[PDB]
Amino acid sequence: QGSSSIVSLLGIKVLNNPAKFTDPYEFEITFECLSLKHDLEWKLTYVGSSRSLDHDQELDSILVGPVPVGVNKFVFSADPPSAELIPASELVSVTVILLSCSYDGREFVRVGYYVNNEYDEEELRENPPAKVQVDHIVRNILAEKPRVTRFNIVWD
Amino acid sequence: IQMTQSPSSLSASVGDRVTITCRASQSVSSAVAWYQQKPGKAPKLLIYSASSLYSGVPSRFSGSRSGTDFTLTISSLQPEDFATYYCQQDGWSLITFGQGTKVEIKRTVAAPSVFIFPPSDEQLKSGTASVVCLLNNFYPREAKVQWKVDNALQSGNSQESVTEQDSKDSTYSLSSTLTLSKADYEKHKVYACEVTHQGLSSPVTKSFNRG
Amino acid sequence: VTTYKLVINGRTLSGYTTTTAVDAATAEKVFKQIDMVSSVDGEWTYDDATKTFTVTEKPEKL
Amino acid sequence: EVQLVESGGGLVQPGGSLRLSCAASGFNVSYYSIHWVRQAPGKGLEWVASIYPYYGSTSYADSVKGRFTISADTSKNTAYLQMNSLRAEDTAVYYCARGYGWALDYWGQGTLVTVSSASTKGPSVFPLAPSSKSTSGGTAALGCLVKDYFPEPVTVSWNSGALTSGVHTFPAVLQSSGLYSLSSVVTVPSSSLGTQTYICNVNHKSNTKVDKKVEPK
C-alpha cells in the first residue's frame, strides 16, 4: 500500500471473446479513485509486428465523466481495427492490443494483451488465400494473462 | 531452450559501440526485453518492448528489432557497462532468456605470476595430498596449466578455478589444485606446474621436491 | 537429533564447528571425519550440559 | 519504497520439497505480475513460473511443470513457489521479480536452493604455506585451502578484515565427492613473511567459524 497513483485498476473483463476480427472490443473495466477532476481517458491501441514493419494504430478512445471516489465499473466498446494499414502477414498472426488509461495527458496504466487471429474454417487454416479475407478472421484475446505496466504521473 | 545470443563473449574497449543480437522465435516487438547483470547481483532492466528504454537508463542503450533478430546497441561503451547482457522473450505460454553475452575490458597483455603450494603436513596426515598452482593477475584469460609429476604428464586429477575479471586491473587469476592420495603422493619426487600463456615468451614451470 | 558443538584449539587452528547427531558418540565420529581435526595430536574433552566437545593440541610426541 | 525479498532457500534431498516465498514491499502483489527466475551457479537466467494479476492463472516452464506451483496471497502480500519432487538440476539461486508489461523491473536479491543427497559437512582449512618458492621479486603468495564442505556458501576473510588488498577468494568447485572446495590467496611482501602474521577466517554458516594461521614452510 505505497503512497502513489490515486487511480488503481482492479479488474478488466473481455466480454466478447473470442470474437471476429471485425467485432468491437468489449472491455468491462473496474477501478478505484482516491480526487482531482480532469476526467480519465481510455484508449485501445493495436500493435502489429511484421518482418520490416512495426505498425501501431489507435482503435478507439473514451473519456470517463465524473471522478467518483471509490470503486467504479464501466464498459469500453472500442472500434475494430482498420485492416487497410495492418501489414498483410499479421492479419492472421499473433498481435497485441494496449488498453491504456491516462490522466491529463499522462498515462498511469497500460494493460497489454496477446491477441491470436486465425481463420474460422478448417480449409482456410490449412490453405489460407493469397489475399487475407478479414471476414473469416476470428481473434482471441489472452485475457487471463494481462501484461500490466504502471507509470507514475502527477495528479494534483 | 535458451534463445541464441551472439556474440556469446565480447572483449571491448571503453568508447566502443557494441551490438548484441538475440535470435528470437517470434516477431512480436512488445515481448522482448534486455537486461544487464553484474556478477553476484540481480539483473536490471534496460530495454522493454524491443525498443523502449526503462526509466533512468542512459541514452547510450537502445534496442531495435528486424524480423526475429532483436538487438541491443551501446553507442559508447562506458566502464560501468561491462557486464553480462541477457535478452528475454515473454511469449504466449513460455518465457525465454538468451544464453547471455559477457563483455569484458580489453587491456594490455599481462603475463601471470606463478606460485606452487605443496600439500602441507596437516592435510597430508589425514591421507589426502592436494597441490596448488596459482596464476596471478594475468591477461587475457586464455592460459594453460600443465601438471607434471616426475616429469610425467598428468591429466584428469586437476581442477581449475578462475576469478572474474578484476574491476581495478582488469586481469584474471587462476588456481589449479591437484589432489592425490597420500599413497600416490609419496611415490614421487618432483611436482611441477607448467604454465603456458601468451604473456610468457616460453612456458614457465614451478616445481618443488618432497613426496 | 541435537546440535552438538566442537571447539578446536591448536597452535594454528582455532574455532568452533557444529554438527547434528542422535547421540554425542556419533557426533564425535562425525567430527572425527573432518581432516582438519583428525590431527592425531589432540586432547579432547566433552560437556553434556552445553553439548560441546573441545580438542587441544600439545606435542606429546613420545 | 519498493522491493522484493525471497526466503526459504536451503538444502533439500532429491525427491524433496521446499517452499520459497518472496515478500513484497511497496507495491502490493495484487496489481502486478510476479515471476520466479532461477540461475544455476555460473549458468544463465532460466524462467521458472509466472502469476498474472486480476485472475490468478499461471505459466510454468516445462522443466518445472507439475512439480512446482506458483501462488500469491494478497493479505500477506507475498508470493510462494512450492517446489515438490525436487531434482538435483533445480539447484540454483531463485530470484523473484515484478512484471513491467512483458518485462521485469524489480528483482529480489535471490535465495540459494541446493538439491543433493550429500549431507551438510563443515570445511577443513589447510595452509597454503608461503615458501621461498612463492618469493617472486620480493613479493610472496600465501593462502588457505577450504576443502570438503557442503552446501555452499563459504566466506573467507584475511586478518579479520585487515587484509583486503591483493586477496583473491576463488570460486567454489564441486568435487567428484559431491563436496565443494575453494582456495583463498593473498600476495604480500616477501620481507613480511617471517615477521608479519597472516590468519584466514573461514565461515561456513555447519555454523563453522574457524581461524587458521598461515605459517611459512
Numbering used by the authors:
A (entry chain A): 1 to 34, 36 to 157
B (entry chain D): 2 to 212
C (entry chain C): 5 to 66
D (entry chain B): 2 to 206, 208 to 219
Q: Could you share sentences copied from the article?
A:
The basic building blocks are derived from multiple pairs of native and modified Fab scaffolds and protein G (PG) variants engineered by phage display to introduce high pair‐wise specificity. The full complex contained the common components ASF1 and anti‐ASF1 FabH combined with either GF or GD to form a tri‐component complex. PG interacts with the Fab scaffold through an antiparallel β‐strand interaction with the Hc and a set of helical cap interactions with the Lc.
The GD variant is more selective than GF because it does not bind FabLRT. Several generated PG variants are characterized by a high affinity and specificity towards FabH with the best candidates (GD, GLM) having affinities of 6.4 and 8.9 nM, respectively. The FabH‐GD interface is formed through two principal contacts that bury ~596 Å2 for interaction with Hc and ~185 Å2 with Lc. The specificity of GD comes from the set of hydrogen bonds formed by D39, S43, and D45 from the GD with FabH Lc. Side chains of S127 from FabH form H‐bonds with D39 from GD. Additionally, K126 forms two H‐bonds with a side chain of D45 and a main chain carbonyl of S43 from GD. These interactions are eliminated by the significant loop rearrangement caused by the two amino acid deletions in FabLRT. The inability of FabLRT to bind to the GD variant can be directly attributed to the two amino acid deletion in the FabLRT's Lc, which induces a significant loop rearrangement which places its T127 side chain into steric conflict with D39 of the GD variant. Interactions of I38, D39, and M40 from GD are formed with Fab Hc. M40 of GD is buried at the Hc Fab interface formed by P124, S125, V126, and V212.
